[PDB]
Every structure is written in structure tokens, then in C-alpha cells.
Amino acid sequence: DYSNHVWQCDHTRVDVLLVDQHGEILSRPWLTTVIDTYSRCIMGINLGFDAPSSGVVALALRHAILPKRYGSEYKLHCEWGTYGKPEHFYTDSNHLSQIGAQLGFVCHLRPFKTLNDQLFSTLPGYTDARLTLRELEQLLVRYIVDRYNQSIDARMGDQTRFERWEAGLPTVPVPIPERDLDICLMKQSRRTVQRGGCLQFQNLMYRGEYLAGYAGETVNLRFDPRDITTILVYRQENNQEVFLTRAHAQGLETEQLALDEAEAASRRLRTAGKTISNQSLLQEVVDRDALVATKKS
Template sequence: MTPNEPVDVHPNPVIISELPEEATVKLEVIQSLLEPCDRIAYGQRLRDGAQKLGISVRSVQRLFKKYQEEGLTALVSSNRADKGQHRINEFWQDFIIKTYQQGNKGSKRMNPKQVFLRVEAKAKEIKENQYPSYKTVLRVLKPLIDKLQKAKSIRSPGWVGSNLSIKTRDGEDLEITYSNQVWQCDHTRVDVLLVDQHGELIGRPWLTTVIDSYSRCIMGVNLGFDAPSSQVVALALRHAILPKKYAQEYKLNCEWGSWGKPQYLYTDGGKDFRSNHLLEIGVQLGFIPQLRDRPSEGGIVERPFKTFNQSLFSTLPGYTGSNVQERPKDAEKDAQLTLRELEQLVVRFIVDQYNQRIDARMGDQTRFQRWEAGLMKEPEVFNERELDICLMKVTRRTVQRGGYLQFENVMYRGEYLEGYAGETVTLRYDPRDITTLWVYRRNNNHEAFLTRAHAQGLETEQLSLDEAKASAKRLRSAGKSISNQSILQEVIEREVLIEKKKSRKQRQKEEQSYKLSQTKEVIELTESTESVLEKQEVISDSSLDDIEVWDYEQLREDYEW
């Protein structure tokens, strides 16, 4: 295969629970071969991969072909039971380690070659003909040497002038010089209590953010009650990668214009970021997941959470505060926001405020302006189906007669599904709106897109996964049968209730506003009256000063009247 030929990347390989270290190295080689390049560079990558894996170039080509056919399972090989164990007795293993440690105490220094010479001398002393070779000594000491080198490695250089450099767990320094080069992702528990559509308390949601390291611009988010996982990360990435459009109900003054695909995804070492699912997404979309060397490297992605808390969450009803001991007493009583309402507020804050603010290190550019100016090229536009196959939540169902499917007590129907009655298909969906499902059929190790399936009678509505579960629970408790019509009716009644609630609040606001205006008028009239009286008093006082008083009797006596 040549680099100019189309690469038939495996669309949805079998997901393995845990990827061994050896398979991870193979996956890195596969990632390098998937990146676009010319014929000369492709040949060099083959040779580099062969050297890295310790196999021939032809073996690397066979491995790449096997990966295209089988996915991640091609990278996992059956290992010997004693793999990783040194085939020398315990005496020699302890002698090698102790000799190396004693030889490097304090100011002393001893290398593996000198340790091997001590091994030879000891073998002669005890008259042992079978002793460890130099390569065996190297294998025994490799973990110790690697540990010492990592301990001596310097911290990330950080900001050098106007450039930022970060260090990966592999010891690589990434110098960030343009937008969409390095994205960072992390989660936080939102310090706001939410209620469901019926006003019942349901708890605090999780917020996942994806941030561009060069501009500090927020690229995408995911807000929901699911705990951090690779699927939650995937949904946040999907939101970040796609161009974003929002309805008028979000009341945005600006557009969320940042999107594209990163070259690296830089995260902490959490299990959700080390998953095979995320590695496979990186291979499919063409970015490389990298782990942070130290927790202190995560300031770029963690600092915005504090901004959210101080500038947004602390102003909302139901705010709990980050300190449990200092939690407001009436947080549970004050809670009144739903997940959808909070999501609208978060989006509005990001688009109209956070991305439009000037970062301290950016001078006269807002975060969005810096992101836009720092693009090396126009971001790649992905087909949503490509992202669905890698990023959306997955479940499996059996097709019923007539092409119908049932999911979360909702009945769906998809075009062209009649002929697949009785077959098990894969459903992919966005938990924020499950009125549409994407249906895939598994063919060997591949999944082929079949059609969309729409919720019957709910095509014009928006129904999240949590709302569907809450509606079903409410209908069960009321002793009613669950169907699309009952769920639709429940949604309609809920919307009417919310509108009434909003109207009542609006009337209360109007009454308060009217009372306030009346109070202001009375105060203004009182102040005006007092001002007039004061003026009249001043005028009266000044007039009295100008009047001259004559004594009539005195005048008669003086002038002999």
C-alpha cells in the first residue's frame, strides 16, 4: 500500500477492555502511518516504526494491513506466561540491583557496563560458569534507570516569551505555536443543584470542557449527569469538532465560531483518558492523545472552572458552593433550574462572555480573536456520520416487524428497516435528544450505517434521555400505560406547566416593578414638594428682610402732625 491510495480505516473495531503497553506502542506506529504524507515520508515512517517495534519493515506493513481488517484486536498478541520476568535466579537479580544502587549512592556513579564487570568478578569468585550476560544486566536495570531519569527530568519550561511549552508523560516537550494544535479536556462537578421538569431535586451535573491551549478559547462542552467516562469525553469532543448553531431560545449576541480538529489531545492520567475508546477515536479522526507529566501542567483547562464558579454558578438559584461546610442553608429549597436551562446559561456565558474576554497573556486580543488569528489553515469539516460512529453513545436492539425499534419505552420507526426484522442492530444516540437514533448493522468486524429512526409522534419535540426516564417513572407511579402518546402528552403538559410557572413569575416581577415605580413616584413627589416649600420659605425670608417698618407715633411727634 502507498500513501496515495485511499486508507480504508476500520470504522468501528472491537473495543478491548484494557490495551497492553506493547499494543499501545504498535498503535502509535499505526497513528504515524495514518497521517497524510508523500511516498518518501511514508517509507521513512515505515522504517522508524520497524526500528521502534524491533521488527522488519515487511512485518510493520503486515501489522498495518491486519489492523485495517481487525481493528484493535490485531494489536493484541498472546504473550508467554513468564513475559516480563528475568530468567535468572534470585541471587543474580539481587546482586545486580544492589551493586547498581550502592554504586550510585551519594556522589558515586556506576553505569550498567561496570555492573556487568562486577558480575563477572563475582562469578569467578564463586566459580560460577553460568552468569547473566551484559544484555540481561541491562534488562534488569532498565526500570531503575528509567525511574532515575524521570526523577531528574526538569519541569515543563512553561512560557518562554510568547510561546508555551508543555511536557507529556513520555518526556516529550510540546511547543504550542498555533490554534487547534493542542486541545485540553477535563471535568468538574457543577456546584448548582438542579431539579427535573416536575420540580423534584435530582442533584448536581458534571461539566466537561474542551479548551484550545494556544488561545484559551473553549471549543466545546458536555453537560449531564453521567459521571466522567470515555463516552462523556467523546461527546464533548464531538461538540468541539463540529461547527455550532443555536436556536433563538439561547439569546446569543455572538456566535460560537470555534471548531475543528486538534493535533494533540492533552489530558491527565484518568481512566477515562487512558481508555481504548479514546485511543481508537484518535486513530479514526487523526489526533494523538497525550497524558500530562504532572498535575501542575493542567492550569489551562482547570482555571476556567473557577471562572465559571465565580462569575456564573454563584449567581444562580441552588448554588451549593465548593465548600460543604459553607454551603448555603437554603440551597435545596432555592433549586429551580433544569438541566436544559442550565445548559442554555452555560452556552450563553461561554459565547458572549468567556470567549470574548481578553486573556491576561494575549494583550489586545480576545480568546476568540486569538484562536481565529492563530489558525494555520481552515479547519477540516467532518461528516456527522463519521463522528457518530466514533463518538456517540451506543446500545443494541432487535428490529421488530414493520421496521420498528423500542428504546427507553419510546417506539421508533426507521426507513428500509422492514427487511431487517429479527436482526440485532446497533443504535447510536445523543443523550441530549433521543428523538432521532442512528442505526448501524454489524458486518464481520465493521459497522455499516443503515438509516435514521425517528420517535413516532415526537418528531417535532426535543426529548433528552433523562427526561424520557423521568416521564416513564412518573407515568408508572400514576398507574398509566407507557407509550409514545402518553410520553408526548406528558411532555406537552410539562411544557404548559413550565409556561404557567414562567407566566406566574413574570406577573410577580411586573407587580414588583409596578410597586417599585409607584414608590419611586411618591418619593419623587415628596422630594419635589419639600423642595418647593423650601424655596418658598427662602423667598419669604428674603422678602421680609427688604421691608422697612415705620413707627407712626414717632413720625407724628417728629413732624408735628
């Protein structure tokens, strides 16, 4: 009955194409969002080129339930602040069930055209692609929160959907610890620990707090595709995966780095290497054999 009872999870594919930092054409991202039933409030979002499998929804859960920390680059007016453990969740593999179970809320899986109507559908490259994925992250959290969430609802227009949701919480929305919500993260596995507790990830190099005790061992990683600047490392066991430490990206030139940016860095590094002509490096190979073809003992 009350707002915050059943949480809807929605998907769409954004008909705006993007360009990469170095000018490569990106795809069109999928948008996934978590919204109330009885308010129209938006409480969670993820956007990216990952297909709307269990991945983007598992992150969009994590997005909502934690405290909504935000950056200055967003130029936000409003604190989003929408923490709170859900209790029912509703979506279009099974992994969502394990999360719902472990977090103790029923998952009983089987409106975005508001942004199709809005000028959002007219930014460059809609429907010269002069925008990138980090720019969408900064602007879209703002243009949703400060404008599409804080405004008066389409019907029951006596309340803004945020405030209809905020007062309607059966008591007060309760945040919960961050580190227990790692199951919602991405996963990478069988990474190997180098001298001093070191790890490679996405062509970057990482180092841990106490990870040097397990050099030569192998470990799994989890991360957000929004800032890989520190990623969680866990020791694998037979039926338990135990969190060991954070590990910190090293040698990067910025305070923040999205996964898409590590892909772009690699893709520029890779695409540079692809342009080098082997013409000399190749012709010497047949000429070495044509010489050795004269050998007889």
C-alpha cells in the same frame, strides 16, 4: 507552537443542584469542556449527570469538531462556529485512543474556577434548586460564548481568546462530515426490529427509512444525550458495524427531547405505577388458595 495545536479537555462537578420537570430533585452535573492550549478559547462542552468517564469526553470531542449549529431558544448573539479537526488532544478506559486513531490525531492523555468566581456559582440551589438541565444547556452556551469566550483574555489581554484562536489557526478551521463522527456517540446494542422497521428506545418508539427490510433482525443504536429525537441504527457484523439509517422518534409531543427528559418521562410513568395499592389485588391471592385448599378429588 500555534494555537489549535494541542486541545485540552477538562472536567469539573458543578455545585448547583437541579430540579426535574415534575419536581424531582436532580443531582449536581459534571461539566466537561474542550479548550485550546495557546488560546483560552472554549470550543467544546458537555454537561450532565453522567460521570466523567470516557463518555462525557467522547461527546465533548464531537461537540467541537462539527459545525456549531444552534437554536433560537439559546438567544445567542454570536455564532460559535468553531469547527475544525484537532491534531493533539490531552485529558485525564482506552476508548479515547481508538477515537484519536480513527480521527488521526494524537491522544496523549495522562481553569473552570473562572465560573466559580463568576455569579454562575450563585444561581438558585448553588453550593431552592429552581432550575433544570435544559435551562443550563440554553444559558451556559450563551454565557460562555457571548461573555466568557468573546471577552479579553486575562493575560495577553490584547486579544479576546476566541479571536486569538481564530486568527491563529495555521490556515482556516475546516469542518468535516457528520456521519463519520459516530464513534464519538453513545452506544446501545442488540435492539430488535419489529414489523415495518420499528424500534423501542427509552420507552419511546422509533421507525426507520429502510429498516423494514430487517424486521425480526437485531441492530445497535447510537445517540446524543442531548436530542434522542433521531438516533442512528447500524447492522452488527463479525468485525464491522455498518450504518444503516436514521430512525425517527414517533408520538413525542415536542420537536426536541433530551435523554434526561426520556428518563424523567419514564421515572414519572414508573413512579405513578408505584403508588397504586395492591391491597385488593393481593388479598384475593391467598383467598383463592384458601378456597382451593378445600378441594379433594
